[PDB]
Amino acid sequence: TRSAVVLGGGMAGMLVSSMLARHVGSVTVIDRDAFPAGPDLRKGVPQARHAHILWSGGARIVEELLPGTTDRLLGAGAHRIGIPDGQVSYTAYGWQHRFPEAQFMIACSRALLDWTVREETLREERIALVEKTEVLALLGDAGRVTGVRVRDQESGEEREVPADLVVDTTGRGSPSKRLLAELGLPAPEEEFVDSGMVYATRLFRAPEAAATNFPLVSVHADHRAGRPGCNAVLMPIEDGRWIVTVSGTRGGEPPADDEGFARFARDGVRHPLVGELIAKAQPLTSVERSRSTVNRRLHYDRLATWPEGLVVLGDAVAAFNPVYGHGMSAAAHSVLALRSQLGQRAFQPGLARAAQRAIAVAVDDAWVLATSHDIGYPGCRTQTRDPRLTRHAGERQRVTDLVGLTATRNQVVNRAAVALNTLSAGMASMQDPAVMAAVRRGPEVPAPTEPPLRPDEVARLVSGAGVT
Ligand SMILES: Cc1cc2nc3c(=O)[nH]c(=O)nc-3n(C[C@H](O)[C@H](O)[C@H](O)COP(=O)(O)OP(=O)(O)OC[C@H]3O[C@@H](n4cnc5c(N)ncnc54)[C@H](O)[C@@H]3O)c2cc1C
Ligand SMILES: [Cl-]
Numbered sequence: 001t002r003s004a005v006v007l008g009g010g011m012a013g014m015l016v017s018s019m020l021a022r023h024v025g026s027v028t029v030i031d032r033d034a035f036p037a038g039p040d041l042r043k044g045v046p047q048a049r050h051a052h053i054l055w056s057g058g059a060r061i062v063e064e065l066l067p068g069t070t071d072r073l074l075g076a077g078a079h080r081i082g083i084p085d086g087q088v089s090y091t092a093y094g095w096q097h098r099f100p101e102a103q104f105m106i107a108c109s110r111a112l113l114d115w116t117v118r119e120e121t122l123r124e125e126r127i128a129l130v131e132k133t134e135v136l137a138l139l140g141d142a143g144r145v146t147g148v149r150v151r152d153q154e155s156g157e158e159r160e161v162p163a164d165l166v167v168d169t170t171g172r173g174s175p176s177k178r179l180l181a182e183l184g185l186p187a188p189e190e191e192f193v194d195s196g197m198v199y200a201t202r203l204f205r206a207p208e209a210a211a212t213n214f215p216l217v218s219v220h221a222d223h224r225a226g227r228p229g230c231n232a233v234l235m236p237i238e239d240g241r242w243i244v245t246v247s248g249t250r251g252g253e254p255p256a257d258d259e260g261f262a263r264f265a266r267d268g269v270r271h272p273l274v275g276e277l278i279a280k281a282q283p284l285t286s287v288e289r290s291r292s293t294v295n296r297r298l299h300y301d302r303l304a305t306w307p308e309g310l311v312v313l314g315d316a317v318a319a320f321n322p323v324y325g326h327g328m329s330a331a332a333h334s335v336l337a338l339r340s341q342l343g344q345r346a347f348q349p350g351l352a353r354a355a356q357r358a359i360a361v362a363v364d365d366a367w368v369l370a371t372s373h374d375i376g377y378p379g380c381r382t383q384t385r386d387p388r389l390t391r392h393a394g395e396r397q398r399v400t401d402l403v404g405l406t407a408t409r410n411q412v413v414n415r416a417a418v419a420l421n422t423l424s425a426g427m428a429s430m431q432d433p434a435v436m437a438a439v440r441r442g443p444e445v446p447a448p449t450e451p452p453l454r455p456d457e458v459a460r461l462v463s464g465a466g467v468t
Pocket of ligand 2: 046048292
């Protein structure tokens, strides 16, 4: 019984559809894109050309919604990389000592990740993906949404799709501001923090022996230094490839040309390690860029009027600077927030509003982590009323930096820091007495004086071929 319509069949739409099909009789997913039969790039998810880190916090929720997905990913060549044991990371505070595993991430092409999630979701026959279809309007009125009007691209025919619940998951380019204006609702408060960050990515074929068990390698900006923030990330993906994404804020953007890419990875960031490693590998693709890096949030949950039967989640409600790697995990937390409200309130009036407020809570940690570190870069453009960004940014940063510095050299602080950063634990967790006690106990290991690479990792950067 009951029907749901989901706008957008990307990550949030597939996760939310899988969840909803366990609560309603049918789910219809409307997407303007065409979908490949295999793990290919598609125009509706251009960000799949860039490195995607799936932190443990989101991975565990994906697993809860779509059992078997994590193993299916690893089974297809995705890498499980332990954090911090499997990462070689030059943080703002220095090299991270590679303590034993506290958390993990899943490393693969976003195209394979999307394909795996969609194929698993659509095994449920009561979920139908309706491709190459435009969303024209929300049906109903400002009091209650009752479906959507859509247009088949090939035919041109329009039709009404009824729904007891409409969920907008159309991503960063979502048209919900327009759709909700057409209903007669006031505009939501828009909040943004725009560092001017630009991404540049190439794919490489890794040296053959390093195609597995190779670490995630990252060189981070120093958010406290009054210079443009620049980063470089090397991440293993399936079938023996490396995806390498470099990034820079206003005044430090990476160039678009292949030769300037490798130069930036060496000299544009604070340590040349990623540039040194890509010199061991064979480039496979030319440079792809992206400017979709603004932290932007729409406060739908605080609107004076909200229609029954309408929920917005994923990048459509809150989108983040991708260098922090939280977007997919925030979407998953948001799907669970909607599920929690469905279990509590069924489809009573107040469900959609309660879900929208719960979704605002679900994305808040990712929002604070990204915005608190972006707000400081030169020339950052901001629009916010959040006193955590406007009043108490300094002492929050002094607490952040004390934790971040100590996490590089203290196993207990690192465990707490990565639990929060993978969105496996909430912000309050860091106020636990045991964590601040370990912070005060200070470093337990020396600061690494060189990249903490293992000999057996660097040994696999060469073949030994030209040697008798
Ligand atoms: C460069 C970059 C790097 C990133 N790296 C990471 C990372 O390392 N880790 C991480 O967790 N996240 C990362 N993200 C964020 C992640 O890509 C998004 O958070 C995630 O895709 C959000 O899913 P979504 O379903 O809300 O939107 P999307 O995945 O973008 O899906 C939106 C869907 O809606 C459809 N659609 C869009 N507009 C319309 C329309 N008008 N009508 C109909 N259908 C429409 C699209 O075709 C698509 O199918 C990165 C993002 C970028 C840009
Ligand atoms: Cl993009």
